[PDB]
A paper describes a structure:
They catalyze the transfer of the γ-phosphate group from an NTP to an NDP via the formation of a high-energy intermediate on a catalytic histidine residue. We produced a truncated version of human NDPK isoform C (residues Thr18–Glu169, NDPK-C hereafter) and determined the 3D structure via X-ray crystallography in the absence and presence of various nucleotides. A data analysis revealed a hexameric arrangement, which is organized as three dimers, as previously reported for other functional eukaryotic NDPK variants.
Crystals with GDP belonged to space group P21, and the structure was solved at a resolution of 2.17 Å. For NDPK-C×GDP, we observed an unusual crystal packing: two hexamers contacted each other via Arg80 and GDP, sandwiching a SO42− ion from the crystallization screening solution. The residues contacting the guanine nucleotide base are the same as in the ADP complex, except for Glu169, which makes contact specifically with the guanine base in the adjacent protomer.
Numbering used by the authors:
A (entry chain A), B (entry chain B), C (entry chain D), E (entry chain C), F (entry chain F): 19 to 169
D (entry chain E): 18 to 169
Write the structure that this text describes.
Amino acid sequence: GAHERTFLAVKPDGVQRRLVGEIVRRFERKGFKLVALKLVQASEELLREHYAELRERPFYGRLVKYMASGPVVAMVWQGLDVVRTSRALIGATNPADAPPGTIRGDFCIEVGKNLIHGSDSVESARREIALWFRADELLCWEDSAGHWLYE
Amino acid sequence: GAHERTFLAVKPDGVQRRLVGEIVRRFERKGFKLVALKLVQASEELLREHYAELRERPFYGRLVKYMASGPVVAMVWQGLDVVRTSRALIGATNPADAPPGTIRGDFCIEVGKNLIHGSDSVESARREIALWFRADELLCWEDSAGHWLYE
Amino acid sequence: GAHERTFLAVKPDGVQRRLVGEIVRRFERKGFKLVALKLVQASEELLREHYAELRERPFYGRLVKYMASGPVVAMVWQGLDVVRTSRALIGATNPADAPPGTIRGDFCIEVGKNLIHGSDSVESARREIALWFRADELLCWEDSAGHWLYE
Amino acid sequence: TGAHERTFLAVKPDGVQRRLVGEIVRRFERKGFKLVALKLVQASEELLREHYAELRERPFYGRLVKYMASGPVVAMVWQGLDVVRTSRALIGATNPADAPPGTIRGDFCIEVGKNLIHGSDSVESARREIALWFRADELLCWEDSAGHWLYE
Amino acid sequence: GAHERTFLAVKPDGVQRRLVGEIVRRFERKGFKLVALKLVQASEELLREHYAELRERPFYGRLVKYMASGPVVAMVWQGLDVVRTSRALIGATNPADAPPGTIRGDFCIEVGKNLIHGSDSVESARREIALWFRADELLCWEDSAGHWLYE
Amino acid sequence: GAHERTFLAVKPDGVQRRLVGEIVRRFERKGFKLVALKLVQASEELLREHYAELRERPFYGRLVKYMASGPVVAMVWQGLDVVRTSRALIGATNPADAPPGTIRGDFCIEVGKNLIHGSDSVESARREIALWFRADELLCWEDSAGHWLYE
Ligand SMILES: Nc1nc2c(ncn2[C@@H]2O[C@H](COP(=O)(O)OP(=O)(O)O)[C@@H](O)[C@H]2O)c(=O)[nH]1
Ligand SMILES: Nc1nc2c(ncn2[C@@H]2O[C@H](COP(=O)(O)OP(=O)(O)O)[C@@H](O)[C@H]2O)c(=O)[nH]1
Ligand SMILES: Nc1nc2c(ncn2[C@@H]2O[C@H](COP(=O)(O)OP(=O)(O)O)[C@@H](O)[C@H]2O)c(=O)[nH]1
Ligand SMILES: Nc1nc2c(ncn2[C@@H]2O[C@H](COP(=O)(O)OP(=O)(O)O)[C@@H](O)[C@H]2O)c(=O)[nH]1
Ligand SMILES: Nc1nc2c(ncn2[C@@H]2O[C@H](COP(=O)(O)OP(=O)(O)O)[C@@H](O)[C@H]2O)c(=O)[nH]1
Ligand SMILES: Nc1nc2c(ncn2[C@@H]2O[C@H](COP(=O)(O)OP(=O)(O)O)[C@@H](O)[C@H]2O)c(=O)[nH]1
């Protein structure tokens, strides 16, 4: 399961507050493999589909508008248990519940400005990756650090 | 809500071990707004009042003497849920119980040298702010990061 | 000329050594604006054109092959004097001549593994940007830090 | 020795707004200098005109004053051997385009009008600037435990 | 109990991934006292004895082979509750269970490459210290930070 | 060439001020290979020999006494031009002349407390290595990062 992949996006607040490198560095130092990366301005149409599961929620409309309000950094990361572990590194949805050491615990205050999205499951990750990236934007490369991260 | 304030003080051990910048930087990167700051030598009289609720505890007298033994950095920080969140950033009173990622978890060993004080509630914060600062030392400024920390 | 842009690329050694976030963070903290970003595997054809001015140099062939051997992170950064200033942040071509504090001074040893490319002039930057990015990959966003970086 | 030399430093409003107060303080701490005074204040135009009196004839004087008064500043006094000259080196050239990486301005700024921090340019300026911004009872003497490991 | 000691070792993955400084720095900033340090290539015989309690486990053989595959940084740290607290800083054996903020939580993925060993009790620490170090490699020095870490 | 070695020692001030990890990390991130490491309490006799060339200087006596006053971290690092480049990373003998970005420029004030020693030439390095280390304390290991630092 070392080829598992997750979709992460730095939300517009992360770009505006200059935390892109900080966030990328946390996934690098953890040992995951970066397999796709781009800075994009997502359309409302794409974001509506990205957050389809939340269409009934009262914040859906403002969440979509906000995620479209500025650039996001879309990413795919690969490694064993990357989906679950990425969620742990990011921390709870509401930063007030995310402990220090997590991204949201260290860098945010409020649920509407919580810096980053990560897929919530392997199935969501597959859907999100296909939605945001073409297949030719996902790169296979020989990772020399693999020998020192895996048994 | 977002105008809530807490009182923090770097204790003399924090100054002596050169952790003032490190501590301030953790509150900055979290998103909170610095509204007051000074290096002072607090009197025993002020400290007796600051720690009034601990008058019956066996360590009261040495706690007061210690907090008066050297400079402290007094601070006020503003933001949503700043009192509770500041306590979480700092970690448990006893550093042995404070997880890594918190200030006391990362930087201290023993309860009598635990680097920093934060208000334990909104009501204590109001009392502590008034005790340590005059009203004209609390500054209102237009925070340009506000749009990216709050809805 | 606050709208000046430069092309930067993290070379394969930078990706392999997990210094992408570190590098991006240095440009962020300096105040420059990230306007394009992607992880790509560049073709030999593109790299031959990228390094056209070096066609007569003895290392040209291996430089092309090497830059095509693995993923690169291509970037565009915007700000006053960004081309010249980025070169200063990166440091001399030969890391042995790059002082500590620069990227190559802090992280590299030898000229062939020197982590990063930056455009050497405004004219080179224009050519390099057009070569590596389509116009719709360069984003305009309203920068909230701008008031505090520029008069 | 000259180990009791003092300098005046101020984080300018851009430094506060960009959340670089801790970063800046940390650089002076890790260098070994002793923090002897600190406060967050909103300086008046009158004080700033006097602070920058030597620049009254310069074309940017007016905008410099207005800007330094536009937001909170962190005023500081640091103590140590050669602290005035060495602080200037840590900060870097006035124009960030001339400040090398490793300096504060080299690492964190772009333009001369937004260059994060002020440091005294000489011992005499430092004495004047300290007196202008601080009362004597805001400068603290404390016994520095790291002193044995910074000095002979 | 401020003279309690623990044995820590950076495993070969920690050396290869260049995390020795990072690891040492976390113990320094916590306040503990470094009392012994060396880079060694441990023999399989020593490692078999080190991990004697795990002789029946299925991974014993590969654990021994791996710990002998490269240099290790052997260390002794001294301070109040250093054994238990070191374990907390390192995090759970399986990095998937170690929260962000811990060494394994921040830097590792899998139990077979988990960066570092720490003694699990005072008695194990005594045994491990004697096994890896001669008495004349353990140094007593006067710690100037002690006044600011201990009541 | 790439097998050149230098002797470095963190002086007692570096240990006391908790900068060992910070120092090691700078040599790691630069790309050099750690081939020996130990914490020792050097005798006055060894230090007199270490600094033999300075016997006539007025500060010789106090330099010896001071270097013997607490633990030092002795190290050997390997790589291309490591002797000269280590000196550049360390900075000028007198920290007042060492630019920010160097170890002494970032962390010290005065020549008598300047944190670290590095060999001043290849010949001094050979002498210093033999003086401080037995041959069996210098390790050969296969460095996986070498592919990304060297041609
Ligand atoms: N304004 C607002 N946004 C919310 C709230 N709950 C969730 N969100 C946003 O919706 C995104 C997705 O919600 P969810 O899938 O439950 O959480 P996540 O997996 O941690 O992002 C979050 O990342 C938030 O930005 C809420 O109560 N209010
Ligand atoms: N010496 C000593 N100080 C203690 C003890 N318990 C609490 N304190 C101190 O009392 C201060 C305030 O106590 P408390 O209200 O429990 O906690 P705090 O809000 O975590 O600071 C702490 O910050 C500690 O330094 C104890 O058993 N001994
Ligand atoms: N192997 C090798 N590579 C070189 C040499 N000179 C330059 N290069 C490579 O070619 C790249 C581009 O050369 P140039 O633009 O002169 O330098 P830059 O602007 O500092 O990158 C450098 O960054 C190196 O990767 C050399 O003498 N040998
Ligand atoms: N806008 C602008 N400000 C300037 C210029 N030259 C100097 N300054 C400002 O004047 C302040 C004090 O002047 P100076 O003594 O030259 O600089 P400093 O000692 O490095 O602060 C600087 O810190 C700048 O913010 C200039 O050409 N234009
Ligand atoms: N390869 C492998 N090693 C394991 C496994 N379980 C434990 N270990 C190793 O055993 C070492 C010591 O075992 P234990 O005391 O249970 O863990 P520790 O105290 O966290 O080191 C760990 O540090 C791991 O490297 C496993 O399932 N596979
Ligand atoms: N106290 C004192 N030590 C000095 C002086 N000049 C040199 N040293 C010390 O001598 C050591 C070795 O001498 P040198 O070769 O000049 O310096 P290094 O190679 O940078 O270590 C230095 O590391 C200093 O601590 C001086 O004027 N006074």
